[PDB]
């Protein structure tokens, strides 16, 4: 169904998309791309501390059952 | 929608597994690989990327180790190539311990021996390879200048091929040139880009600076012979040149400077750098001070005199050159003889001779 | 030129001199082409008026060469074009061709100067001078001047 | 460059997944311990 | 600026692909000297929001992400759109810089696609169109100079230039001056 | 020059003047060398034709110096080379040497102008002028 020209254009354009994403990875990082990782760290901190608090309250109710 | 498809759109479970593999959800990928039994590990992203390629591209080492244990997992050669390109040393080590590389001799055999068998080992999709088909793991590591990866691959026996001469008549070069003649030249440029890198130069050979000088002249000639790719060969030759310059730049005492400049005091490497026009090597302060100490051999104080005092001694040589030659013939070995054999005094004698010649030319036109 | 590179003051100067000479050789070739063009043109134009001109400027090949070359430095007068007869058309064409020659000379000279300035702006003077001076030094390291070295 | 930072972002993401799964393991173990009580 | 146009502006390849999967397409603005009722009403209403909207739609069309993911032959589309924007730059002089930048985007997209070829078949597919060098003719006609001056196109043209002069391809300039004189 | 640096308009100008003079002194030295070369050459060539020339341009040392120096500004005519006799070889060599002299003068002048432009492009005019003007000021502070 596809002809050799279509196959070759498909190959070349997939290669171009991958190469362009790689070249985008070669751009200098900007302040926003780092604020994103800071927010990553912040949300992770919140989730982990809430998990620890869950563990503590469960141990408290287990003591109460004892 | 898009008038090109690079990957029916899998399954909900396959999409979830690809999400877990790309974003490093280790527990989910382990659970699925253990007990899914309907999922296939070779399911494909929208870009033509299976789970192993996604895990390697995002540096998920634990997900990579989990996937490598799954039998009949595909795209392992390209996984190694991608990990080498990104410089993920630990993922490269994990991939190299796979039976695909441990049992076989994939890394030792040449690019042409890999290419003769179809075998689709470094293919990442239905049709094609991520980098050039001639770019082997060692060549790619040299390109990216991954020093540790280059060392690892060298430990395994991988070596860059040293392409044949340009005007070559052997059957292999003849068939390569008649077949494509553009893939051939691009492959030559790739192999030279691998050879001319500082990582491979430093880690591969016994005397990297001699190799770098010779290869720099080699690429400089290649640039003239093959003019369409003149810029590429010129850049590679410059890489070699400044590798030699950087190696010279690190010397900290006179013994190392001698080892760099005298080769194994005949300044063989300085002669080679002037012959091959490695100008930054010769003009570097270390080579410069060595040449300068040789220049003022026995003229200890004269090394520091002002230019006026050296003009004075130039004039004095111009005046006493008859007496100086007479004394050189009479007393060949003395204080006078030792001073007369110093290179700077030889040069000032030549300059004074030429100035006497011009003065004779002028004074002949007197009256 | 064998002696100047040893001087830190005069070395870089002489290096830039070699550079600019190597560069402007090409514009000299192109100017030779255009100058030969105009020379042959004006020679064919004026050759028949050997004894009908103010001077003998464009009568022969060599004298046309002399006149047109000395026109580069403005050392040639404009009365060389004038005729003694009343052939106004020929002398008007002479005026036009000589003026166009001078204008084209100015155009070529400006382009050369500036292709050169561009080659300069994209550029190591220290490195080049030190390479040349190191060659000069190494020429003397191998174990009397030519005038006195006749005696064996 | 942007890729060297995306690598650290993926580091953080995988670390988050592992830690949350560890906390869930702890919770389910406490649940089975309650059941044994 | 619709979601697809914004994704094309930012060159978010995955987002552009997602939106294309959903049926979103950039509009291909009408001709500059257009007389239809919609263009007439848009031009009479504001005539500055109209031109800015045209520039936005062309900024979306001229992006490498949309060019690569949207059409069947992205290099032909990019050449034609580059000439289109080059003419737009002359027609609409107040926004000359914007159209010029977009046309340059298209040009270097074509150049980057040519830059990726690894064997002669792909080079032929890029240069010969679907050996009449149709795309090379188009690049010279539209003045995509980096495309024609690229080493791949250059070596193709050079192999065509020395068709039967196998050894003469490598001779010094003196030998070619010799053969010039011999022909004379 | 003792007064101009005080003016904000004229200070930087005079600073650049001192700079370009200090620079072109070196090319003046080189031009002295090449000019002396050509002078001695043409003097030795033409000295024997004291009363066989159109004018006395290249007959003596001082007059050869005058002619060749004034040739720098195009103020010297080209008839100075012509001889009265039929020694075509000598006058042809004179034409060749004088033309080569003018061409070499143009070459040296272009190189000087441009070594200078390069020295300029890699460069503080405010700082230099203010340093000079501060020296000028401090010269007057002592009672
Ligand atoms: C003023 C008249 C009477 C004589 C002019 C002579 C110059 C045209 C020539 C002849 C001798 C030459 C000099 C002979 C020796 C030297 C030392 C030489 O080396 C140095 O600068 C000192 C440091 C070193 O030698 O490494 C630099 C060139 C120089 C000045 C030469 C520069 C050109 C000079 C001055
Ligand atoms: C027009 C003819 C008749 C007289 C030309 C005189 C100029 C050649 C000289 C003589 C007096 C000089 C001026 C005397 C005083 C000053 C003020 C001096 O300082 C200032 O610019 C004002 C601010 C400050 O002094 O700090 C700058 C130089 C200037 C204009 C001198 C510039 C050069 C001048 C004009
Ligand atoms: Ca990681
Ligand atoms: Zn061979
Ligand atoms: Zn319309």
Swiss-Prot record, chain A:
It is found in: Cell membrane. Residues 7-27 are annotated as: Binds to IP3R3. Expressed predominantly in brain and at much lower levels in ovary, colon, small intestine, lung, prostate, placenta and testis. Ca(2+) 3 binds at residues 28, 31, 33. Ca(2+) 1 binds at residue 40. Changing residue 4 to H: In SCA41; no effect on localization to the cell membrane; toxic gain of function effect. It comes from the Eukaryota. Homotetramer. Interacts with ITPR1. Interacts with ITPR3. Interacts with MX1. Interacts with RNF24. Interacts with JPH2; the interaction is involved in maintaining Ca(2+) homeostasis in skeletal muscle and is mediated by JPH2 'Ser-165' phosphorylation. Forms a receptor-activated non-selective calcium permeant cation channel. Belongs to the transient receptor (TC 1.A.4) family. STrpC subfamily. TRPC3 sub-subfamily. It is linked to Spinocerebellar ataxia 41: A form of spinocerebellar ataxia, a clinically and genetically heterogeneous group of cerebellar disorders. Patients show progressive incoordination of gait and often poor coordination of hands, speech and eye movements, due to degeneration of the cerebellum with variable involvement of the brainstem and spinal cord. The cytoplasmic portion of the protein is required for channel assembly and gating. This is Short transient receptor potential channel 3. It comes from Homo sapiens. The lineage of its organism: Eukaryota, Metazoa, Chordata, Craniata, Vertebrata. The gene is TRPC3. The chain holds residues 844 to 909 of 921 of the full protein.
UniProtKB/Swiss-Prot annotation, chain F:
Residues 48-87 are extracellular. It comes from the Eukaryota. Signal peptide: none annotated. ANK repeats lie at residues 8-37. The cytoplasmic portion of the protein is required for channel assembly and gating. Homotetramer. Interacts with ITPR1. Interacts with ITPR3. Interacts with MX1. Interacts with RNF24. Interacts with JPH2; the interaction is involved in maintaining Ca(2+) homeostasis in skeletal muscle and is mediated by JPH2 'Ser-165' phosphorylation. This is Short transient receptor potential channel 3. It comes from Homo sapiens (Human). The lineage of its organism: Eukaryota, Metazoa, Chordata, Craniata, Vertebrata. The chain holds residues 627 to 772 of 921 of the full protein.
């Amino acid at each position: 169904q596809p002809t050799r020209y279509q196959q070759i254009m498909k190959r070349l354009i997939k290669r171009y998309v991958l190469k362009a994403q790689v070249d985008k990875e070669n751009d200098e990082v900007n302040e926003g791309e780092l604020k994103e990782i800071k927010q990553d760290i912040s949300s992770l901190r919140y989730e982990l501390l809430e998990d620890k608090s869950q563990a503590t309250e469960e141990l408290a109710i287990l003591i109460h059952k004892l | 929608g898009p008038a090109f498809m690079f990957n029916t759109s899998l399954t909900a479970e396959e999409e979830r597994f690809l999400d877990a593999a790309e974003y490093g959800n280790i527990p989910v990928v382990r659970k699925m690989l253990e007990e899914s039994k309907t999922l296939n590990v070779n399911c494909v992203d929208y870009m033509g990327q299976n789970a192993l390629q996604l895990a390697v591209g995002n540096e998920h080492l634990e997900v990579t180790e989990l996937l490598l244990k799954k039998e009949n997992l595909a795209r392992i050669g390209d996984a190694l190539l991608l990990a080498i390109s990104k410089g993920y040393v630990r993922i490269v080590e994990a991939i190299l311990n796979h039976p695909g590389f441990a049992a076989s001799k994939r890394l030792t055999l040449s690019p042409c021996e890999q290419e003769l068998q179809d075998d689709d080992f470094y293919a990442y999709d239905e049709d094609g390879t991520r980098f050039s088909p001639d770019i082997t793991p060692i060549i790619l590591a040299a390109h990216c200048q991954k020093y540790e990866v280059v060392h690892m691959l060298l430990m395994k026996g991988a070596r860059i091929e040293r392409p044949h001469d340009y005007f070559c008549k052997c059957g292999d070069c003849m068939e390569k040139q008649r077949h494509d003649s553009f893939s051939h030249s691009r492959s030559r440029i790739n192999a030279y880009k691998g050879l001319a890198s500082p990582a491979y130069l430093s880690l591969s050979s016994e005397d990297p600076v001699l190799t770098a000088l010779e290869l720099s002249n080699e690429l400089a000639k290649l640039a003239n012979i093959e003019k369409e790719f003149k810029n590429d060969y010129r850049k590679l030759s410059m890489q070699c040149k400044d590798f030699v310059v950087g190696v010279l730049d690190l010397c900290r005492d006179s013994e190392e400077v001698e080892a760099i400049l005298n080769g194994d005091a005949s300044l063989s490497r300085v002669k080679l750098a002037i012959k091959y026009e490695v100008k930054k090597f010769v003009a570097h302060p270390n080579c410069q001070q060595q040449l300068l100490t040789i220049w003022y051999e026995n003229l200890s104080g004269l090394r520091e005199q002002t230019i006026a005092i050296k003009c004075l001694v130039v004039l004095v040589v111009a005046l006493g050159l008859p007496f100086l030659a007479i004394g050189y013939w009479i007393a060949p070995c003395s204080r006078l003889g030792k001073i007369l054999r110093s290179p700077f005094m030889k040069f000032v004698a030549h300059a004074a001779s030429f100035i006497i010649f011009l003065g004779l030319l002028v004074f002949n036109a007197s009256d | 030129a064998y002696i100047l590179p040893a001087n830190e003051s005069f070395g870089p100067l002489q290096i830039s001199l070699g550079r600019t000479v190597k560069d402007i050789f090409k514009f000299m070739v192109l100017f030779i082409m255009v100058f030969f063009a105009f020379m042959i043109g004006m020679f064919i134009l004026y050759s028949y008026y050997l004894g009908a001109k103010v001077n003998a400027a464009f009568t022969t090949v060599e004298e046309s060469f002399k006149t047109l070359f000395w026109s580069i430095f403005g050392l040639s007068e404009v009365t060389s074009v004038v005729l003694k007869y009343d052939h106004k058309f020929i002398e008007n064409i002479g005026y036009v061709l000589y003026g166009i020659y001078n204008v084209t000379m100015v155009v070529v000279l400006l382009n050369m100067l500036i292709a050169m300035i561009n080659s300069s702006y994209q550029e190591d003077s220290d490195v080049e001078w030190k390479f040349a001076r190191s060659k000069l030094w190494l020429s003397y390291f191998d174990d009397l001047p030519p005038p006195f070295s006749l005696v064996p």
